[PDB]
Amino acid sequence: GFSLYTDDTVKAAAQYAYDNYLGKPYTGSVESAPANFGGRMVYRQHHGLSHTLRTMAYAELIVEEARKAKLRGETLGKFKDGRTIADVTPQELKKIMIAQAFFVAGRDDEASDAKNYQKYHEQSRDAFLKYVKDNESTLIPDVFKDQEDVNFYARVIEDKSHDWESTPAHVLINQGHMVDLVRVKQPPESFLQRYFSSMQRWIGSQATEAVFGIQRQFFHATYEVVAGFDSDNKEPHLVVSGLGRYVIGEDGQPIREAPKKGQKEGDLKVFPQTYKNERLMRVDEFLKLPEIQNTFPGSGKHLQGGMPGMNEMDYWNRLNSLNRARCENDVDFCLKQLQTAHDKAKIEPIKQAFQSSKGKERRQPNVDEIAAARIIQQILANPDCIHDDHVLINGQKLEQQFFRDLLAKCEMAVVGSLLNDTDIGNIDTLMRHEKDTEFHSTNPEAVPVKIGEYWINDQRINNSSGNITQKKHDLIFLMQNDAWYFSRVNAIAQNRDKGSTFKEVLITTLMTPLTSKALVDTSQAKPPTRLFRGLNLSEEFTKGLIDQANAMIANTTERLFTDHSPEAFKQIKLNDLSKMSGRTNASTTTEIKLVKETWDSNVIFEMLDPDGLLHSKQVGRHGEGTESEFSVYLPEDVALVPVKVTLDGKTQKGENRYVFTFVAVKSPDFTPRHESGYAVEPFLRMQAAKLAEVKSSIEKAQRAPDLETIFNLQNEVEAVQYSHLSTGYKNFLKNTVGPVLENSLSGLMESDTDTLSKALAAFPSDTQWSAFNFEEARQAKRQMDAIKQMVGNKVVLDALTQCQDALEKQNIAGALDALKKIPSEKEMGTIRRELREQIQSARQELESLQRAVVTPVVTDEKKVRERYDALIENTSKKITELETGKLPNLDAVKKGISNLSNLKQEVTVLRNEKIRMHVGTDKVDFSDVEKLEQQIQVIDTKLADAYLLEVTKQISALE
Amino acid sequence: HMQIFVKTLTGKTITLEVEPSDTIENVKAKIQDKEGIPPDQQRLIFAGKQLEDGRTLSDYNIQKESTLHLVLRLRGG
Amino acid sequence: MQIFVKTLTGKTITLEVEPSDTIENVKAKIQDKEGIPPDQQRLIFAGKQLEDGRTLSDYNIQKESTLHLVLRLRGG
Amino acid sequence: MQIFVKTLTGKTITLEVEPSDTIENVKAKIQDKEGIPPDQQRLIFAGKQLEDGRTLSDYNIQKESTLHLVL
């Protein structure tokens, strides 16, 4: 619970050091001039408040990264006793920081020679002692243990002896001070390589890169210069071991001297020297050195300096401005600035781990969710189809597991949008048709509730008006409270329920999207940035959550040079806790007091939501003593990635309370891979059955295909040539009507063809017929109309078949083509208003084609691809390293089995990333994770054999 | 005796009972008794072919249950 | 017997009640004290929800214990 | 000497030999008793695995002792 950024005791000590020493003018001679920034004064710009403040953050930082490192398999440098930087405690870190505040208080000048050095640090240790002396009544009891303790840290501020490696307290305070010099000294490569190697010895290589990484962000947050790192820097390298240099003379070779059994040996740090012929070694020459390339990550790398997004002119402005002064003067502001920067460096590394998002928006329906919402809609519309253990629609039997699959694979927030107020109103009709019993989630000794009877009577008394808007609130209200409902709905939704009836699974599948829709329409409140959620769980099951949470926090680190993204990706894909708040309308509050106090929660999910993703809707009315509740249906590409895991006191039942703080992160890497067809394929068979009835009825209601009636109208056409009728009428039948009956005869007689479809279009309209006055043309039309309904009846019958043929083999695209064949009206209006049942179907497929296939390799084919190569290379290098493992005793073998246990998990991640980044219709190439899996089975039996050997050698020994 | 069918553009079918060998002129008179149409104003059409009064039904290969198309020719016999 | 019911607001209320009695009656006692309708309030104890109709004896409520009252009203 | 060779499996077996033995002969000797192949047998006694070339007289193995042989 301790932190530099939120401890008034630590900040008070800082305020003191500022008011008295750091904030007072430099009474020294050398470089003690006052600095101006934006029209505000800062007496000590180099070693002022911003200086001693950052250094404290470093301690916080280095200890965090150190503790993260140990959470990985890493072994940190031990001191005289078996303690590492990661063994530093919250109390000890407070002493370190308070000590660290006065570490530059004794400064009078900016002078840098040994005499001034001893003097100023002489004064600094006193200032500390003085401050402690003043507030001994509040510190020495609890903050410190005794005067011995205070003298230890005061001794360190003095630095009489030159040791800085002695203990954690010593290393932190000294490195923290020296690393803050990165923002000033001018061979950035030379210094950085130096400071890196220094910290790498105590904390680790990855942990260090995180440090200087988050260190650049502290500079930007405190308005100090962020230097770059140019691998190709051609300026003269400066050896930091003193102020020496490296030299190359005659032959382009660096000067050396060779001792015993070393071949060529270390470089002669020619101090600064005057030469020739001879030339000093450049930064790039140093960086390309075989010594440096294999030990320093920054070789060949480049870090852009200044600020990204602004030129160096407008950067200079940002450096010489008020906040640069407010930082050096305002202690509260400076802490906040770092605080947010540090807290930021905990999120951004997670974003970098996965491929980028775009907008916060919820996704768009795919085929299955479109068809899904159709089914739900009809169920609410026609409750009659609901049975004891299944729902029947258009001859399709929808079992239990289907509605479970519908809850598992369908973005229910998205299905809810496809529903309407009419579908809300069908809750009343749905609840009338039902008089079944909902049960409690656990609490087997609980009163069952008739859900149908409860709803109806709920609306009679509370919804006197029947107002549709209200209904939604009532549905939402039914959601909160009534643990005879939400207990079963949530337990079913997340597939962690037991002994559930079909009526309970069915209604959950329906009430979920409806409730979500009700929430979306209702909530007009601004989306909160911070939500809290409480759960009751066993201390041992919570123990497993803390480990999974610690895995992700441990392997996600800010970047400097080398990219540790793939590994963070892996660890998060392995321990992810997001699917605990998904698949259902999880309820949350905005006020902590409701989870801590009222409900006495042992586990609290603090969910940070600054980017506004995770759209959460208000529930009930908020106020003083209200729940202040918000529902959240977790989006399928949004994950809740843990940033911190804190212990906060205990509950009423004595057990410790853990508060996990998560952070919403949207990325296509989180979208679940679901095989489509789970809700649409039944829906296609449904529509095919609906057409089968319309086809059958039409096939026997109007029928028969008299061929003779065509022959006559063909004989009559040739017969009206000698009729003394019009000159045009004789031409209309011979030239216009003649050929139509020509093709109509070929089509009907010879198979189907598009001939029947095209001929049906050549049929003269009623308008063309009327323009032949009134006469024996009327007797011609009713003959013609009789013939049209013959061709039409056939084409409409072949279209229903060829369409039904589609649906059988899916091809929802091909089905619609046929239905575009059916004639409309004046071409075909001899079939009754089952035209309605037919247009209703083309309308069902018009909407199924409005599918959106959302992408998972949404760009960053380079990130997705590159990231994969790192993982497989890593995992393969972990398996081959275990491949030739010395198994001396039983301990080495025990370590190997758990290794293999973890590698087994890794390779499947390798597998899914192959699947998820693969495109096309062909065999997914697994050739590489095959060679790995085989290695696994090899070192599975190797250990299992060598295990029994050791367990036997152990019982042998014990006798 | 065989029965054949005669149609009009107006829309009425006429049924006639006749034996083969009868002439077209003879069939025209049979229409006269049935539907009061003068033989002078008749054109018989079959299979796109116009029947002359001298030839029998057997010549045009008209057979039982066949259909004919009667048209009224005015200003001519 | 004496019991305590607390609120998210931050104020504690003191109640005089019998171990006999239902919860709706205890809910009513809170209603009279601070003018809050029993329909809008849910009583919680040890993170567990107390149902009306059930006596304090059923939940094993004892003297000087504390309860947690929260306001759950309908949407509107 | 009388010796016993056991396995973790849960069966105790009694084998008869007196002195001098080396692993090369002992590998064959286990073979004879229960018609079980000695392609790769690891010797267990006093928590240590017996290597071929050293005699049974070496390691000071004695009568009525129990061994735990596993392959």
Ligand SMILES: NC(=O)C1=CN([C@@H]2O[C@H](COP(=O)(O)OP(=O)(O)OC[C@H]3O[C@@H](n4cnc5c(N)ncnc54)[C@H](O)[C@@H]3O)[C@@H](O)[C@H]2O)C=CC1
């Ligand atoms: N849960 C909360 O923090 C808040 C709850 N509320 C209200 O309280 C009522 C209930 O909310 P919930 O307690 O969440 O009911 P719920 O059933 O949604 O979840 C509650 C219980 O599920 C149990 N559970 C078991 N396995 C689980 C798993 N794998 N994932 C998640 N939970 C698991 C947990 O013990 C938890 O107590 C509602 O009226 C709601 O309006 C209001 C604000 C916050």
